[PDB]
Every structure is written in C-alpha cells, then in structure tokens.
Amino acid sequence: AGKNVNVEFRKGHSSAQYSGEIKGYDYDTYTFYAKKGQKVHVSISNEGADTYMFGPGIDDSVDLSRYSPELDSHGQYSLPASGKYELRVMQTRNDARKNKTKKYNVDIQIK
Ligand code: NA
Ligand code: NA
Ligand code: NA
C-alpha cells in the first residue's frame, strides 16, 4: 500500500524533499510535529497528486495544493495547534478508480 514517512529535516533547515509513487487508492503519509503558528508550504511536481493535511485543531482536512483557497498569499498555511500533523498524498477518486499511478516529488517546508 502507501508508505508512511516521518519527516526529518536536516538540522537547521526548514524543508525536506521526498519522492514516491502512488497506485490506485493508495496514499502516502508524511508525518511531523510542529508548533501552533508555524507555517507550512507544500509543493508537488505532479499536480495529479492531491496534498491534504490532517491534524489537531483542523476539522476534517485542509487542501495544501498550490491553488487552494486555504493558503495565504505566500502559499503558506498557519498551523492552528501544536502537535502531530499528517500530510497525505493521494490521487483523485477518478484516477484511483482507474488504478492509474502518480510518480511525484514533494517538497515540505515548515517554518
Ligand atoms: Na493514515
Ligand atoms: Na515547499
Ligand atoms: Na474524482
């Protein structure tokens, strides 16, 4: 199925890059711990791979993709609470139903 990765920044740096490939309904998860008010910016090379974030103080999830209305002018989202957050990378249901695949590179920035 999908893979579950703990995001681990190089010390003194505020981003990390991952690559993956999702098949069908699989989703990959990128987990991290952060403080209320830190800003997250996620960019992904394949816009056919959705990027949604789950965690404390977030009802349901938030779309972090580049055109999402949840983002501010700098493409950032402010974490509403401190704790463990989960970025999920997944295909649309349409593509998942067709057992399509998405190769992707994702850059996760947390400041
Ligand atoms: Na999960
Ligand atoms: Na980024
Ligand atoms: Na769909």
From Swiss-Prot:
One of its GO terms (biological process) is defense response. It is found in: Periplasm. Keywords: Periplasm, Signal. One of its GO terms (molecular function) is lysozyme inhibitor activity. GO terms for cellular component: outer membrane-bounded periplasmic space. Inhibits activity of g-type lysozyme, which confers increased lysozyme tolerance to the bacterium. This is Inhibitor of g-type lysozyme. It comes from Escherichia coli (strain K12). The gene is pliG.
